[PDB]
Design an enzyme around this catalytic site. Structure first.
Site, mmCIF file in Angstrom:
data_model
loop_
_atom_site.group_PDB
_atom_site.id
_atom_site.type_symbol
_atom_site.label_atom_id
_atom_site.label_comp_id
_atom_site.label_asym_id
_atom_site.label_seq_id
_atom_site.Cartn_x
_atom_site.Cartn_y
_atom_site.Cartn_z
ATOM 1 N N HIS A 10 -41.570 88.191 1.385
ATOM 2 C CA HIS A 10 -40.208 88.606 1.767
ATOM 3 C C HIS A 10 -39.133 87.687 1.247
ATOM 4 C CE1 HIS A 10 -42.492 91.348 4.178
ATOM 5 N NE2 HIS A 10 -43.073 90.262 4.637
ATOM 6 N N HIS A 41 -35.386 106.114 -16.376
ATOM 7 C CA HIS A 41 -36.609 106.797 -16.872
ATOM 8 C C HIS A 41 -37.591 107.040 -15.719
ATOM 9 C CE1 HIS A 41 -37.951 102.405 -17.495
ATOM 10 N NE2 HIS A 41 -39.148 102.919 -17.059
ATOM 11 N N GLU A 61 -47.633 96.091 7.149
ATOM 12 C CA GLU A 61 -46.411 95.278 6.871
ATOM 13 C C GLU A 61 -45.429 95.564 7.991
ATOM 14 O OE1 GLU A 61 -47.649 93.375 3.308
ATOM 15 O OE2 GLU A 61 -45.971 93.020 4.668
ATOM 16 N N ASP A 86 -29.939 102.629 -19.179
ATOM 17 C CA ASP A 86 -31.137 103.041 -18.423
ATOM 18 C C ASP A 86 -30.996 102.647 -16.952
ATOM 19 O OD1 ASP A 86 -33.681 103.817 -17.609
ATOM 20 O OD2 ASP A 86 -34.791 102.269 -18.814
ATOM 21 N N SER A 177 -40.971 98.520 -14.151
ATOM 22 C CA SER A 177 -39.738 99.275 -14.429
ATOM 23 C C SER A 177 -38.911 99.394 -13.177
ATOM 24 C CB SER A 177 -40.001 100.679 -15.017
ATOM 25 O OG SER A 177 -40.178 100.601 -16.406
#
Ligand code: CL
Lengths: 223, 164
Positions: A10, A41, A61, A86, A177
């Site tokens: 965290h 994308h 979690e 992007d 990404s």
């Protein structure tokens, strides 16, 4: 994340996981209580977004939130030229409460400095080709626009900057990404693309240059 | 673009990390292989060999740092391991095939292929300029062989089986 390590649990509470049938395919970044920034994308007609994660098992979690989203806005110049602009904004179906493990981050207004040491985080592939169990972090250095353009022309556009490419083979990899590149406590980039396979000596990764989009971001979130 | 390329088990096709068989949906008995065109040397043309299956598996590679393939991505397609660019597909004007699929050892950052939904599976589409319109990959028959080649309107339709 190639040749990084486990993040401090965290320590990156803006990290968002984009998952498809409980498998991660992209990250994003909480920039507002109802908005996640990601790579264009990574666009999907709807999302399941994990906030507050370290391992990707939300069930395990405490304080995590799995939230739904259907509205996303790709930058209108995305992919003109190809690979450029992007970024996209995902609006969460409901606002999220900030906590010790879930927090928004500010976006840099200043462009990146060559030699600046910055932090990338994500759950993408490792140097050994396996997926990690917990969020990985690694430090990479911002590369000059001259070295970026020599390597990537004619696909380099100033909506992009380069980072990494050292002898240490530190780089983003598949599944990273849309995740954050942090410089001096601000969000400076999103993981975008690079040469495949990832980690090659002397080939830095490319990141969305968020300082060029601070007005489009503010306007989309406010409209 | 929306749509994710999936394998025969309904799972998203991975970006470069896993290898897949291209299985013809009405020629499952046939496998991808390498053959000559006539000029001896090494075999570098891609054919469907009816007698040897399941064939050479492929990887689909985007420079994007995402772990799945979407139908809207420009790809490289290649034979062999991730680590090597000896078996990268390209389309080469070559008598008497036309525009033949051939293996080369160089790769552009953006490859020229897209994988697009067709009938019960997928077709390979070639975009030589990386613009809006592409040309379907089909079969051309010569010298007792079936060569992968541009055949617009007459695609070869495949399903994508994880080499697992
Ligand atoms: Cl099957």
């Amino acid at each position: 994340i190639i040749n990084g390590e486990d993040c401090s649990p965290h320590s990156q509470p803006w990290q968002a996981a984009l998952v498809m049938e409980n498998e991660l395919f992209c990250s994003g970044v909480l920039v507002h209580p109802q908005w996640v920034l990601s790579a264009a994308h990574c666009f999907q007609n709807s999302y399941t977004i994990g906030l507050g994660l370290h391992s990707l098992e939300a069930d395990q979690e405490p304080g995590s939130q799995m939230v739904e989203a259907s509205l996303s806005v790709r930058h209108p110049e995305y992919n003109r030229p190809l690979l450029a602009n992007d970024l996209m904004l995902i609006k969460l179906d409901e606002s999220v409460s900030e906590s010790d493990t879930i927090r928004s981050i500010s976006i840099a207004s200043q462009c990146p400095t060559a030699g600046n040491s910055c932090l990338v985080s994500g759950w993408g592939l490792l140097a050994n080709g396996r997926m990690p169990t917990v969020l990985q972090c690694v430090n990479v250095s911002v590369v000059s626009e001259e070295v970026c353009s020599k390597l990537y022309d004619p696909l380099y556009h100033p909506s992009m900057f380069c980072a990494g490419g050292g002898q240490d083979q530190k780089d983003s990899c598949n599944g990273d990404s849309g995740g954050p590149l942090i410089c001096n406590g601000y969000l400076q980039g999103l993981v975008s693309f690079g040469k495949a396979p990832c980690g090659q000596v002397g080939v830095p990764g490319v990141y969305t240059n968020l300082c060029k989009f601070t007005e489009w971001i503010e306007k989309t979130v406010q409209a | 673009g929306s749509s994710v390329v999936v394998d025969t088990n309904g799972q998203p096709v991975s970006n470069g990390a896993d290898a897949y068989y291209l299985v013809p949906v009405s020629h499952g008995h046939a496998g991808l292989a390498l053959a000559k065109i006539g000029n001896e040397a090494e075999p570098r043309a891609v054919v469907l060999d009816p007698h040897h299956r399941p064939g050479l598996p492929v990887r689909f590679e985007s420079p994007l740092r995402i772990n799945i393939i979407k139908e809207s991505y420009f790809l490289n397609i290649k034979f062999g391991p991730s680590s090597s660019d000896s078996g990268v597909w390209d389309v080469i004007q070559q008598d008497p095939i036309g525009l033949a699929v051939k293996v080369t050892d160089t790769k552009s950052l953006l490859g020229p292929f897209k994988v697009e939904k067709e009938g019960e599976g997928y077709k390979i589409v070639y975009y030589p300029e990386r613009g809006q319109t592409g040309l379907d990959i089909g079969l051309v028959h010569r010298n007792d062989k079936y060569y992968l080649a541009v055949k617009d309107g007459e695609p070869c339709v495949f399903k994508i089986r994880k080499a697992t």
